Design a protein around this ligand. Sequence first.
Ligand code: NA
Length: 330
Amino acid sequence: STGSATTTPIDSLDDAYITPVQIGTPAQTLNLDFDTGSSDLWVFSSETTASEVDGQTIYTPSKSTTAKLLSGATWSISYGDGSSSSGDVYTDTVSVGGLTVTGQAVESAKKVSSSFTEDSTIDGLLGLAFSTLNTVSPTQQKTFFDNAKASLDSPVFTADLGYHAPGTYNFGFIDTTAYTGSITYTAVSTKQGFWEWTSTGYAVGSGTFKSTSIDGIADTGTTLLYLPATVVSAYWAQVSGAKSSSSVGGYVFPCSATLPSFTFGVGSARIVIPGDYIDFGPISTGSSSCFGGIQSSAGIGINIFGDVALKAAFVVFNGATTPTLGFASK
Ligand code: NA
């Protein structure tokens, strides 16, 4: 089997992407944030504290003929941005882009933090990291990908995120029309439960490529590119007037600037992020200070190849016995 679903930016900045997901019988379609940096499929629901729901579409298990309470199971998750959610668990039928899994754990939120409530466009998360990170207790649950894998034509999914435009998540096949040149595959460590890999270096604009190992994770659920402070300083030093602002919480730059591109290495291959991808616009409405899309990881504990980086590539998440990542230009 295969599946193919379109993923759409939630706003004009590409702050996250939402993908429609069918849950239950008859189908309830919710727009979920596919997150290769976490491993829980959780939704706004009929159980979510009413004051914490503001415009989201909810899953109502009582209206699904295939929903089962997963008795005794609870979940609770905290993300790298400080947001959180928790609740109880149902199993139900879940379909993405025509690919169906029966018996998927659907984590129903009883509580969500303010950033979730305030974002009416995201009805929940669909985690695509390794199932070792799933938070359900006392019986850990599998991701949608892990449950689908044995049915798939090839044990893979691909992320093809758009810049200011829709893109695609495919499951079970690699669309050879969706990229240019060849795919370069690189090793993955699953030790921390992430799609963790090592980039071979970077370049800023037209500058020389610096060969250097940068461990990090491929994370579709993180908006920006978080890299070591040395790398980030080298990038923003090429933008007149850019500076790190502790009041704003990272690098800012004059909105009048033209940003240089940023290149990262994948083995002997190179992925180029156009400068435009690194502009996240005015810090507050009407400001002439703009927020940068490349930020320091130093206060995180891991480097994160988030959407800024991933959207410049066609990315293969190879879930074979030995997992690998692939990157192609597009
Ligand atoms: Na922000």
